[PDB]
């Protein structure tokens, strides 16, 4: 009996959702993604594990007055993408990148209806933007950057007490690709996790230091 999906407030136009799996080798893992409110329009970044979670979150939303415009996915493993079937049988836009997209379709998984190629991609110009920092977690892991509010969702490439799953992992990159992530958003006030609470820039720096570390072990 898994806990409930859970969404909370995080600053104006922006709500942590957190979902739950037993995931063997874990156990309970919690997942967090973002919801994102321009004007009336809310953005998934992020799905949950599951339909049944990804169409609560969705509900709740909704009845709140705000149409769902779209999700994007910050890598191809079933914790940012488990929703996009259910997403997608809803006429919902779903987005992932070039490779995140190559990768669930090689998997024989459902993939985003719209991908984007590139180091940079605004998801919403000026309000919403991703950004490819290079393998770490995954081959293809990208953050969403909230520009109007210094809010990085690092996804499962942030991991500031431990690397976590290393299965399709880049050991020998993610100390270089954490480097760059933590140059380009040192600014942030907020750093979203997927797996670990939400803290501020210093995740990006515990970050390189666990990725230094994992590495050291050859
Ligand atoms: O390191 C991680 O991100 C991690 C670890 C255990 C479990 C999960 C969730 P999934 O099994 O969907 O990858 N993620
Ligand atoms: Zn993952
Ligand atoms: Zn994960």
Redesign the pocket.
Known sequence: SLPDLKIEKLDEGVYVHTSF?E?NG?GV?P?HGLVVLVNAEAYLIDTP?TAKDTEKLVTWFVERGYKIKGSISSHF???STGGIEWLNSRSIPTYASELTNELLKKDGKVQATNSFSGVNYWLVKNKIEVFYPGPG?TPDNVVVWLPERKILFGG?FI?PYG???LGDANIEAWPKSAKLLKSKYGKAKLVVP??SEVGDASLLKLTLEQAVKGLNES
């Open positions: 799996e995931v874990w893992v997942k594990f493993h079933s914790d977690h499962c991991k690397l976590g799953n997927s797996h």
